[PDB]
Amino acid sequence: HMPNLKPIFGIPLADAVERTMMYDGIRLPAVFRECIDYVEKYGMKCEGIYRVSGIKSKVDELKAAYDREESTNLEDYEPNTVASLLKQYLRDLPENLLTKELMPRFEEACGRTTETEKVQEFQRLLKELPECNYLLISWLIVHMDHVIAKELETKMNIQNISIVLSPTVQISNRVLYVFFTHVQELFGNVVLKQVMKPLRWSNMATMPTLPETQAGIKEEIRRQEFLLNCLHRDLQGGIKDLSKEERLWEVQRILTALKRKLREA
């Protein structure tokens, strides 16, 4: 029969999206957000950010865990590791972000005599792209742009990211440099929406393992309630899945603790 039961590393974007839908299902895989989320929250002041090699021994476990639909607490892993898992994940995806179709035109648009001519070409390229690709290209480049500012503190430069991001989407070095530069020239309101992440807690038995900080609970509750109300509502669309339900009590149980501690801090 078909090899393996639902893979993850080596599928089209939508296929990955439908598999890894977390919040609203804004047409985007979870993996990408999970990795962008960690870097945005914790991996912002990391030297070697996206530059150092991730521990392949951890990465191969992660890709396995995702492919097996398991629990991956990236908040306990190294930034280089998740970043390496991410860039690999993007590689494994058959359809490029810019596809085979538009990809060769990025070389063209990079060799434009004027910054305006470049962005215009990239503009038409990105429009050809599917919705999922459009959003993927937005976040990947915009998030890495903010990483360039972080490079300004982590003692790195656009060139460094460009070197390591080239093998990522399969496009020449100079195109990444121009990618960010033009990415805000094209977008700029593009926002890096972070996600509620699994805890190091096994979600039962214990209790004194939760964040005891007020601002910590405030932010998390906000993020979690949006996850909560949406998932609950999903079921009302004629959906009766035990897996969705299990996660429904899951979010509720955790938020219950948070709601208590909210007025407990």
UniProtKB/Swiss-Prot annotation:
Keyword set includes Acetylation: yes
GO terms for MF: ABC-type glutathione S-conjugate transporter activity; ABC-type xenobiotic transporter activity; ATP binding; ATPase-coupled transmembrane transporter activity; GTPase activator activity; small GTPase binding; transmembrane transporter activity; xenobiotic transmembrane transporter activity
Described function: Multifunctional protein that functions as a downstream effector of RALA and RALB. As a GTPase-activating protein/GAP can inactivate CDC42 and RAC1 by stimulating their GTPase activity. As part of the Ral signaling pathway, may also regulate ligand-dependent EGF and insulin receptors-mediated endocytosis. During mitosis, may act as a scaffold protein in the phosphorylation of EPSIN/EPN1 by the mitotic kinase cyclin B-CDK1, preventing endocytosis during that phase of the cell cycle. During mitosis, also controls mitochondrial fission as an effector of RALA.
More about this protein: Originally designated as dinitrophenyl S-glutathione (DNP-SG) ATPase due to its ability to stimulate ATP hydrolysis in the presence of DNP-SG.
Record key words, sorted: Acetylation, ATP-binding, Cell membrane, Cytoplasm, Cytoskeleton, GTPase activation, Membrane, Mitochondrion, Nucleotide-binding, Nucleus, Phosphoprotein, Translocase, Transport
GO CC aspect terms: cytosol; membrane; mitochondrion; nuclear body; nucleoplasm; plasma membrane; spindle pole
Annotated positions binding ATP: 237-244
Location of the protein in the cell: Cell membrane; Cytoplasm, Cytosol; Cytoplasm, Cytoskeleton, Spindle pole; Nucleus
Gene giving rise to this polypeptide: RALBP1
The record's account of how the chain is modified after translation: Tyrosine-phosphorylated upon stimulation of cells with EGF. May undergo proteolytic cleavage to give peptides which reassemble to form a transporter complex.
Naturally occurring in which organism (per UniProt): Homo sapiens (Human)
Lineage: Eukaryota, Metazoa, Chordata, Craniata, Vertebrata
Chief place of localization: membrane
One example of a Gene Ontology biological process annotation: positive regulation of GTPase activity
Top-rank taxon: Eukaryota
Notes concerning its domains: The Rho-GAP domain mediates the GTPase activator activity toward CDC42.
Positions of the record's site feature: Arginine finger: 51
Subunit text: Interacts with the GTP-bound form of RALA (via effector domain); during mitosis, recruits RALBP1 to the mitochondrion where it promotes DNM1L phosphorylation and mitochondrial fission. Interacts with DNM1L; mediates its mitotic kinase cyclin B-CDK1-mediated phosphorylation during mitosis to promote mitochondrial fission. Interacts with the mitotic kinase cyclin B-CDK1 during mitosis. Interacts with the GTP-bound form of RALB (via effector domain). Interacts with REPS1; the interaction is direct and does not affect RALA-binding nor GTPase activator activity of RALBP1.
UniProt-recorded name of the protein: RalA-binding protein 1
Annotated tissue distribution: Expressed ubiquitously but at low levels. Shows a strong expression in the erythrocytes.
Residues in Rho-GAP domain copies: 11-199
Part of the intact protein present: 184 to 446 of 655
